[PDB]
Amino acid sequence: MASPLDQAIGLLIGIFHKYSGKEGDKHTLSKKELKELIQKELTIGSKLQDAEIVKLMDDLDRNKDQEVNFQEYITFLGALAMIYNEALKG
């Protein structure tokens, strides 16, 4: 009965598939659709950090420039969770 982890990986699915579902059934996000996910999930509205988001987009696009696949988007969230610093300390 895997509910606690299955619903957390289900959060990442339910976030990701909104943005591909804007054009079709696909398991990928194109570089500008990936940037839409970042701005619509992490609502930094009117802040100067969009210049950091175009570099975060270049870190995500380093997996594939044309469109970033769901598994590599989760590999990147694995780096994001590791770089959180305090999370792996308590």
Partner: protein, 31 residues
């Protein structure tokens, strides 16, 4: 076949009810 996905497909059969609710919540926030 690839072999990998056929071992992972056994974990789908666990029978959870919350994952399919949480995906809907993560979609419904953007209605």
């Amino acid at each position: 076949s690839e072999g990998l996905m056929n071992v992972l497909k056994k974990i789908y059969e666990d029978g959870d009810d919350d994952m399919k609710r949480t995906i809907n919540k993560a979609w419904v926030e953007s209605r």
